[PDB]
Amino acid sequence: GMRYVIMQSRDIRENLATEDYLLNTLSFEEPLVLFYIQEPCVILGRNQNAYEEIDLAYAREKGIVITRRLSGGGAVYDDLGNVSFSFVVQEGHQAFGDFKAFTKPIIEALHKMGATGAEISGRNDLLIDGKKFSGNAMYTKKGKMYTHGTLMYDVDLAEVQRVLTRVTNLRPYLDEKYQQLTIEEFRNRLLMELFDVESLTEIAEKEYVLTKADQQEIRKLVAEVYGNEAWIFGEAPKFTIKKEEKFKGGIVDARLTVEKGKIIELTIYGDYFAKKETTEIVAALLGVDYQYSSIWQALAAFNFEDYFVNITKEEFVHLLVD
Numbered sequence: 001g002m003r004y005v006i007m008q009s010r011d012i013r014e015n016l017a018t019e020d021y022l023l024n025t026l027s028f029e030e031p032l033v034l035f036y037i038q039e040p041c042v043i044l045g046r047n048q049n050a051y052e053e054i055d056l057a058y059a060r061e062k063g064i065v066i067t068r069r070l071s072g073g074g075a076v077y078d079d080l081g082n083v084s085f086s087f088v089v090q091e092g093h094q095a096f097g098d099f100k101a102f103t104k105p106i107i108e109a110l111h112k113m114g115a116t117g118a119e120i121s122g123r124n125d126l127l128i129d130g131k132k133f134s135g136n137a138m139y140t141k142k143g144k145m146y147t148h149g150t151l152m153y154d155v156d157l158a159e160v161q162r163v164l165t166r167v168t169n170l171r172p173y174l175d176e177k178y179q180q181l182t183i184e185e186f187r188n189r190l191l192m193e194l195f196d197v198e199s200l201t202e203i204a205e206k207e208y209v210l211t212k213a214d215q216q217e218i219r220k221l222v223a224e225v226y227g228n229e230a231w232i233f234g235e236a237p238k239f240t241i242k243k244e245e246k247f248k249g250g251i252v253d254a255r256l257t258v259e260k261g262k263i264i265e266l267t268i269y270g271d272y273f274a275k276k277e278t279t280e281i282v283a284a285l286l287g288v289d290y291q292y293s294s295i296w297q298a299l300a301a302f303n304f305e306d307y308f309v310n311i312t313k314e315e316f317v318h319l320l321v322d
């Protein structure tokens with residue numbers, strides 16, 4: 001039943017908007033697989049601090065496009081040596097955070113293309129010979145989700161390290177016949193492995209082609225979100241207290257203003273994954289007494305599996321107040 005979309009743009013902002021738009025107009029009838037390629041860019045996780053993750057002056061110098069995605073996780077640098085994939089599907093009860101199930105077909109395709117021993121590790125990365133060639137993230141909204149990931153074929157690894165504040169390319173591990181492909185050919189071969197065919201003509205009717213009504217709405221998302229300075233960089237947090245810890249589920253970085261024993265301002269940054277927006281947690285804490293019992297009580301009704309995957313409510317409250 002799956003369909004596919006090959007994005008034509010080389011702009012990360014248009015490609016993310018396309019994914020956003022396709023998730024928001026998905027039918028249960030057909031899940032999608034998306035493939036997209038873009039020019040030098042950095043993509044921030046949903047709750048990351050732009051100013052701490054990127055060397056902005058260097059990105060500015062080199063014309064590296066900065067944006068922010070809807071999924072959690074960390075910062076990624078992409079260039080024309082990367083292809084990104086996305087599985088857009090109806091969310092089953094167990095599905096969110098199950099990177100093993102969602103990356104299985106990519107691993108199997110890569111194994112078939114000669115990259116044997118490729119495996120999932122650190123929960124959301126794909127490794128080969130102990131080295132990361134892919135990071136993955138998930139987003140869900142209203143029972144629909146995507147899992148999207150990078151595949152480093154011929155990324156400039158030096159540039160990755162320079163613009164962000166063990167990794168590897170796939171090319172050396174693939175069979176000889178796949179070792180001198182264009183990034184487009186690499187993408188197309190992956191696609192063919194996923195649908196278990198020899199040529200694209202065997203699945204041309206499974207392509208979904210973006211209409212002009214689609215393109216118009218995507219254009220609006222780029223203006224309002226993915227190219228929007230307010231969305232990308234966010235407002236400066238007002239704070240005198242910073243609490244940062246690494247948990248099983250990633251880093252949480254909390255910035256607080258406390259006055260007369262009450263929380264007046266709170267900003268939460270991190271690279272955790274989440275089904276729901278962190279803004280709801282912040283809204284519940286504003287004006288609350290800055291003490292464990294009062295903070296816990298304010299968050300009593302929240303299911304923390306929804307807000308911070310693999311970080312407990314107790315951990316979070318202790319972070320805020322210890």
Ligand SMILES: O=C(O)CCCC[C@@H]1CCSS1
Pocket residue numbers: 043069072073074075076084124134135136137148149150271
């Ligand atoms: O590994 C992480 O922590 C984040 C990975 C995010 C992958 C996204 C793919 C399409 S845009 S960036």
Ligand SMILES: [Cl-]
Pocket residue numbers: 302303304305313
């Ligand atoms: Cl909980």
